[PDB]
Design a protein around this ligand. Structure first.
Ligand SMILES: [Cl-]
Ligand SMILES: [Cl-]
Ligand SMILES: [Cl-]
Ligand SMILES: [Cl-]
Ligand SMILES: [Cl-]
Ligand SMILES: [Cl-]
Ligand SMILES: [K+]
Ligand SMILES: [K+]
Lengths: 358, 379, 358, 379
């Protein structure tokens, strides 16, 4: 799936054409297209848990916006497609608009229907036979949870309960006709697990940033490789977690073990679960893994380097000012306005010119 | 809920969903790595008695069509897949995969860990198994049916698939543009080839005609004599299930042809035949060769071809008589692939030069053969 | 199908509710639901020839209007249902908005898909077989014409060529379990005909006005009945043509023969064709029959009484003025303006106050 | 294109579409006027060997479901309709009509002028016919088949449909709410009724159970002796195909029961049998009574009931013994509808009191039988 950055170019023509406009790309592996597709969506780093809705069901104008998005593709179409299904457009109607082979579309529709079940049944309807069905479809814990009106965590627990966990298969180029020694894996909801973690060594986990976007480029990927290359050299068992197909980090030669997966709390936890690494570095892949730091730790992840808390200290506007305050250092005047008339005053205080961050 | 279940000799279970006919199936289980060509695989006579497992997860994306039937009927025993697509999406489609399976009364199961299964065969070697599709599949029965299988080894399959009476074939290959051509007139085909149906693939015939050959397809057991009577331009030994025992009819016959100056060309089964008749021995492979990405080297030119493979048996390169040279060898495992009589106008390839499905890389094999017939005629 | 008159009540809420707003209704009989509905649509006297579109295919905003018309039914809903299938909506989508049983929706949908083929093959693709299938589904010559891009007469020409005509079945209260002596019929595209016209008497055919509407009431029907009753008594074999279920005119006792059909040129010609009446009265059923007069005559029908042309003389503004003139009679000063400024001047001429007829 | 064709004895041809299995079907053609109830009519054993035409154009609107089955299988020989709806649309549906027919292997044809067909059967009386469904139905073959048909007219149908061995029935009627009830316990029903299976409809059994009867379903050839042996509360003579010969077993046993004081009740064929056994004569009706809107007057009370009818033969009122008094007659044609033995506690009704499908107006006939039973048990 390609990654765009149209919100950084307001005045720009955001319709997809023959000239590329995307800034990066994400890749996923599944045992099925539906699985493959959803994993990719949730690894895109655009805040999607999958086929999250763009328009409201009770919007009298929604079919119109849906139609437009569908006929003249933008970066959001994939989503507008599921929305089409929610709104009652047929597979054929969607086809005439987008020209996307019905083979694909049908799959999307199926996903939209299951979703609806979900939403109808609530968390209660989440037996273990279904939940597992949902999981083999690539549904993410976070997706279901919105659907079921619960916390992602709840779904997470539930699974734990059912002992509902993915398995890991390997890449071998030959559909298992031969054996491999490489450890290039991906998750799926099948039977046999091929992870076969080592009990043997001290393992260090490196989290990547996923697909590139402006501000989260190759520079971060550079660091991540270096971490692996270094520690592996030092003798640790290095395990890379990333899903950006263009990089050096996702080259099986860069680490001992490679998990081509979405850099999500869910997918990460899963890997940890069986790897039980010594430590995990979340300070090298950019904003992606960094946002995951608190959560991971509370979830019991052995986060190494600057603590997640520490991190927050610096990021948090209030926590930072405070420490700046404490060391007795120079920082520009600031304020935290809530109302227009409020700022105008505070503004007088601080002094033009000003820097207005939202 | 349409339950399905497959069980192995070893007692390894695989639960799923029924996508084909209702009932049970039993046979040797194999795996084929071909990502395209599922119909042509199913209709392959060579698959008789066998239970087919396909590695590629989505089977039936393009539905089905007559032109993709390599034989008059679905020879595989059962079908094992990971996912059956919601729809078929292909301008060539005439009938969905489920529908077709049922139409052909095949017992098939989807939604199972075909990876697991594949790895198991790879590791442990080929295994007989039984699929059970129905309201409440019985594991034990399945298991029963699984063990009780006599199995391929030591089985005359060819006989099961060969044609009753003899016939003439004058049909050429398919074209995107034209599709399947109308059978050529016999006065339009310069050569006459006699072909032994051991469970021959249509494509093979098609490609020969394509080549100028008028075909006379004969039962398996046909005697060398009844044939030599036809005054053939060359004699052909088709592919087909199982393997021949040094004991049977064709062996004898072929040898006769080998006393003659008639050019002789064998494929797959026929490649083994030609070999047996020439003095070598065959062996059953661990798991065999079933896919369309198989490298094979033409040792003479030092060139590789990507080839279509379907064969559980093999010609022991070790037992080779001296009148038998090595032409091709498998780059995957180094097993024997092709041979030529130094003495005679006889040669056979272990892979399917006719593919369908798979790479047309080995097509030129045929040209050799024609090259031989032409020369024979010259004389 | 109910008949509305909203256009006459501009500021009225035109949404359908528990309080009746209809002013009449038409009825049709068909051997199939499709056939029966289409026949009713073409006899509704609203200008419809079947499922005529209401919104355009290239209107980006169409889905929204359609959506609105399906969710909150007005008198036009039937036509917005087809427009919906045209635009990409599924039967399930339509169902959720309207609550109309899918048993009906699927039928309309199939009609639309058929229309699409028609439009596609054009008149040349109208072979005898296909044209027969269409007729069988209740398609009017006028509607096919429209899709084929020809005049109605051309569709009809084709039918004559293929000897593609309907048969007449009879109403019997018993599904043919017993015979009838009554002549209460409806057209259908089938095999056996039961019209069995007489060769005996001098026939007169009276055309009704279809469903009642404002200004086209019972009054006209009254007249229609009287004709039938009178000429019957006088010895003629009286044939009534009408499809208004509420009237005395469609009572089988009113006439010798009753054809419960759409009062259209297509319908009336088919009947004339087999009945071969001595004369046809077109002046008593109001506007509906009056509007057919010229075509009927032109196609060979023995219209009686005041002539089609005469009727035109009077109705036509110009023809009339001329007559009035000729008789040296008094007629309000008039003008036939084209533009804004033209009228203002002309007005000046004519004098206020003015009556502005469009 | 799926062609189908129906040809009459008289050579009349109806060209249409196949909606069920592929193949041919021959039998006496009948028309039924029921606007609802198609599944119930098709599963009625009285339609064995007959080709059913339904006058109501749209057939399959509500799909099908098990509760609407009047027996263990479809008895109609073939089905003839005007239109097969695109979809079934009813919360009760469990399978669309076409798949059902296929499932049951019935040859069926749609899209023909069923009104012309009906008018013809009315006018000229019943006729034999054959439906052929296939690639290229041969109208001369169909005509042959129809002409060759031996027909019903001196056929033993009931033996065909009857039960092999006797059995117990204690299940009651269906309800919107609860659906079809679990079968009652023996001790939950006060009366024991022995019912002669002449191709009996499920609804009759259910309705009897609704009224207190535990049933013992017996083969039509079952002897009076063996029966009496069971000590019955009442005897019931089921509905069924054809007509019985004066000749046959059953008339014999009936008469026996009639020597006794056990109360006897017959429905349809059962009524026939009762009248034959009582010395009355049966006739074959022009076309018969097949519908659900048939007016029947109870002559005793002077009242009219709308009834469900399904019969080709009728009791001669003229040939009526004196110990046989007329209880109901048709208001459509005046034909004999019900009788009562003055001398005995036995009565019968030509129509189907159990309806299914059809109006429930005649249900109370069942109650007189209960009364009868209750008195017998008093003495
Ligand atoms: Cl569930
Ligand atoms: Cl499995
Ligand atoms: Cl041929
Ligand atoms: Cl109002
Ligand atoms: Cl056509
Ligand atoms: Cl017909
Ligand atoms: K499974
Ligand atoms: K027809």
């Amino acid at each position: 799936i390609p990654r765009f950055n149209f919100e950084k170019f307001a005045g720009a023509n955001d319709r997809l054409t023959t000239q590329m406009k995307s800034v990066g790309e994400v890749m996923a592996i599944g045992r099925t297209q539906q699985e493959s597709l959803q994993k990719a969506l949730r690894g895109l780093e655009v805040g999607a848990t999958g086929f999250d809705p763009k328009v409201s069901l009770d919007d009298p104008e929604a079919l119109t916006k849906i139609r437009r998005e569908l006929k003249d593709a933008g970066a959001d179409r994939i989503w507008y497609i599921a929305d089409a299904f929610r709104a009652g457009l047929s597979v054929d109607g969607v086809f005439n608009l987008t020209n996307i082979d019905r083979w694909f579309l049908v799959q999307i529709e199926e996903l939209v229907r299951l979703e609806e079940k979900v939403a109808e049944v609530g968390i209660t309807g989440l037996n273990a036979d279904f939940l597992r069905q949902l999981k083999r479809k690539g549904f993410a814990d976070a997706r279901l949870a919105k659907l079921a009106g619960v916390r992602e965590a709840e779904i997470r627990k539930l699974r734990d309960q059912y002992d509902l966990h993915p398995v890991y298969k390997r890449v071998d180029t030959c559909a298992a006709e031969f054996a491999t020694d490489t450890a290039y894996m991906y998750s799926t909801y099948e039977e046999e697990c091929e992870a076969n973690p080592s009990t043997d060594r001290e393992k260090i986990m490196v989290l990547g940033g996923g697909p590139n976007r402006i501000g989260q480029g190759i520079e971060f990927d550079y660091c991540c490789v270096h971490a692996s290359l270094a520690l592996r050299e030092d003798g640790y068992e290095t395990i890379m977690v990333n899903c950006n197909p263009e990089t050096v980090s996702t080259d099986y030669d860069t680490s001992d073990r490679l998990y081509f997966e979405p850099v999500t709390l869910e997918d990460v936890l899963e890997i940890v679960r069986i790897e039980k690494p010594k430590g995990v570095i979340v300070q090298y892949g950019g904003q992606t893994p960094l946002k995951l730091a608190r959560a991971l730790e509370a979830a019991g992840v052995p986060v190494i380097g600057t603590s997640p808390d520490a991190i927050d200290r610096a990021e948090d506007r209030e926590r930072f000012q405070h420490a700046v305050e404490r060391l007795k250092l120079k920082q520009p005047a600031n304020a935290t306005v809530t109302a227009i008339e409020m700022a105008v005053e505070k503004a007088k205080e601080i002094g033009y010119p000003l820097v207005v961050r939202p | 809920i349409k339950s399905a279940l497959l069980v192995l000799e070893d007692g390894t279970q695989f639960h799923g969903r029924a996508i084909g006919a209702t009932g049970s199936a039993v046979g040797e289980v194999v795996f084929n790595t071909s990502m395209t060509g599922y119909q042509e695989i199913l209709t392959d006579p060579s698959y008789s008695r066998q239970i087919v497992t396909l590695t590629y997860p989505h089977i039936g994306n393009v539905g089905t069509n007559d032109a993709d039937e390599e034989s008059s009927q679905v020879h595989a025993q059962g079908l094992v897949i990971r996912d059956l697509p919601l729809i078929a999406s292909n301008f060539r489609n005439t009938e969905d995969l489920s529908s077709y399976l049922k139409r052909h009364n095949i017992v098939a199961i989807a939604d199972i860990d075909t990876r697991k299964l594949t790895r198991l065969l790879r590791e442990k070697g080929a295994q007989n198994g039984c699929i059970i599709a129905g309201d409440n599949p019985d594991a034990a029965l399945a298991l029963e049916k699984a063990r009780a299988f006599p199995g391929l080894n030591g089985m005359d399959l060819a006989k099961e698939v060969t044609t009753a009476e003899a016939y003439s074939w004058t049909q050429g290959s398919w074209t995107l543009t034209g599709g399947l051509p109308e059978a050529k007139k016999e006065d339009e085909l310069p050569f006459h080839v006699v072909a032994y149906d051991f469970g021959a693939k249509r494509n093979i015939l098609r490609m020969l005609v394509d080549r100028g050959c008028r075909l006379t397809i004969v039962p398996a057991q046909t005697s060398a004599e009844d044939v030599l009577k036809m005054n053939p331009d060359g004699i052909f030994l088709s592919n087909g299930p199982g393997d021949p025992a040094p004991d049977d009819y064709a062996i004898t016959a072929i040898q006769k042809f080998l006393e003659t100056d008639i050019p002789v060309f064998g494929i797959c089964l026929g490649h083994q035949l030609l070999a047996l008749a020439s003095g070598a021995k065959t062996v059953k492979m661990k798991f065999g060769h079933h896919g369309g990405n198989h490298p094979v080297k033409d040792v003479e030119k030092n060139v590789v071809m990507i080839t279509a493979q379907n064969h559980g048996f093999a010609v022991d390169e070790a037992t080779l008589p001296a009148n038998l040279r090595v032409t091709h060898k498998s780059l995957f495992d180094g097993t024997l692939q092709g041979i030529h009589r130094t003495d005679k106008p006889a040669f056979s390839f272990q892979g399917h030069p006719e593919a369908s499905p798979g790479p047309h890389d080995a097509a030129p094999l045929f040209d050799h053969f024609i090259e031989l017939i032409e020369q024979y005629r010259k004389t």
